[PDB]
Amino acid sequence: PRNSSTLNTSQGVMLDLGRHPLDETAIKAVISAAAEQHMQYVELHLSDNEHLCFQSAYLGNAASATVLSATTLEQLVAYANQLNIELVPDVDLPSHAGAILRQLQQTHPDIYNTVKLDDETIDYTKPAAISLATTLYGELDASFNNQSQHDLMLGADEVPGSASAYIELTTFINQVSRFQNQHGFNTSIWNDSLLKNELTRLDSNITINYWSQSGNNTDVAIIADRYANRVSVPDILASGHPIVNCNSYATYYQIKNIGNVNDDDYFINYLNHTFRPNIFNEIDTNGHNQDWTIEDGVTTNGILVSLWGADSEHVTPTAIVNFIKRMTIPRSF
Ligand SMILES: CC(=O)N[C@H]1CN2CC[C@H](O)[C@@H]2[C@@H](O)[C@@H]1O
């Protein structure tokens, strides 16, 4: 399978629009900031449980300053292209899909009843769920097409299901990835819903964004289960998938907290001076979340910084942009 992605050797920033919507003016200022800081891409997390921030012809939602029309997205892609920045759509499925589901209930109540697993999740074991996913992604691919590099984050974080259900999650991801490849797009997913036993069945051109082996769990029984059953970085190296380091200690920050001088200073200084690209957040042999796991087998250096948006309505675009302008993501081990 073709894998033209270079995200595994790139530096980028992710904006959580699904929790903290932004308009075109603000997103252009983020793109500019990323370019000033020598980043290669900006990832737009366009939907989550809270908000649906892309217009879909199929879903029938109305556009606005923050529900980005195809024309607005095309303008942002053209702006990014002028600054030599890749714009990476990021539309979470099958979970973190509450806003898509609420809209689908209104315009396709039939399809909603078929595909709703829970309030946040489409039923990825059913053919109707893959059909929905490819319909939405095909629409977005066209809006994001007029640039050199084509990547979309499918996500697949925090997915509900049994171990048996997860077998069907692999199939869902692969079918969507193959559809995307037909449209010239590479696909990324998070690591946390990936079983060891499924990893070799996941297409090898799918990039895995590695945030936390435990999914930021502290319950010791959950940790034990994820240590035994969920992918490590060594597992991913053995399977041959590309990796992006999204270490949840070093690379995650809540928009809500921007402007807190000490916290901002620690995050920035740790990122800029202490963190290294081969340092992952994995479970150690003592059952601890070890955010400083050195992986000597990793030869690539990709890092994404994630700005998560819950409960951050009053944080301004200027504050977000100025925080990005402080970042110098490390490139050397
Ligand atoms: C990939 C991932 O981090 N998934 C979720 C869990 N993380 C952990 C830190 C945030 O809650 C963030 C949340 O906003 C995300 O939706």
Residue numbers in the entry: -1 to 331
Paper text:
One key enzyme class is the poly-β-1,6-linked N-acetyl-d-glucosamine (PNAG)-degrading glycoside hydrolases, of which the canonical member is dispersin B (DspB) from CAZy family GH20. DispTs3, DispTs2 and DispLp all consist of a single domain with the expected (β/α)8 (TIM)-barrel fold for GH20 catalytic domains. The β-strands in the centre form a tunnel atop of which the active site is located in a groove, presumably to allow long chains of PNAG to bind. GH20 enzymes use a substrate-assisted catalytic mechanism, also referred to as neighbouring-group participation (NGP), in which the reaction proceeds via the formation and subsequent breakdown of a neutral oxazoline intermediate.
DispLp has a high sequence identity of 30% to DspB, but in marked contrast showed very little activity on these substrates. In comparison to the synthetic PNAG substrate, DispLp showed increased activity on the partially deacetylated natural substrate, suggesting a greater preference for partially deacetylated substrates. In the active site of both enzymes 6-Ac-Cas was distorted into a 1S3 conformation, which is consistent with the proposed catalytic pathway of GH20 enzymes based upon the 1S3/4E (Michaelis complex/product) conformation for GH20 enzymes that was first observed for the S. marcescens chitobiase. In marked contrast, the Kd of DispLp for 6-Ac-Cas was 1.12 mM. In the structure of DispTs2, Glu300 (Glu332 in DspB) forms important ligand interactions with the C4 and C6 hydroxyls of the pyrrole ring to stabilize the ligand conformational changes during catalysis. This residue is conserved in all dispersins apart from DispLp (Ala308) and the equivalent residue is a glycine in StrH. Unusually, DispLp has an alanine instead of a glutamate at this position. This substitution could explain the 184-fold reduction in the dissociation constant of DispLp for 6-Ac-Cas compared with DispTs2 and 6-Ac-Cas. Interestingly, there are two waters in the DispLp structure that superpose well with the OE1 and OE2 of glutamate (Glu332 in DspB and Glu300 in DispTs2), one of which is coordinated by Gln252 (corresponding to Leu or Val in the other two dispersins); these waters might compensate for the Glu/Ala substitution. Therefore, as well as implications for its catalytic efficiency attributed to a loss in hydrogen-bonding capacity, DispLp might be able to accept a β-1,4-linked substrate since there would not be any steric clashes from the 4-position, with the groove now 3 Å larger.
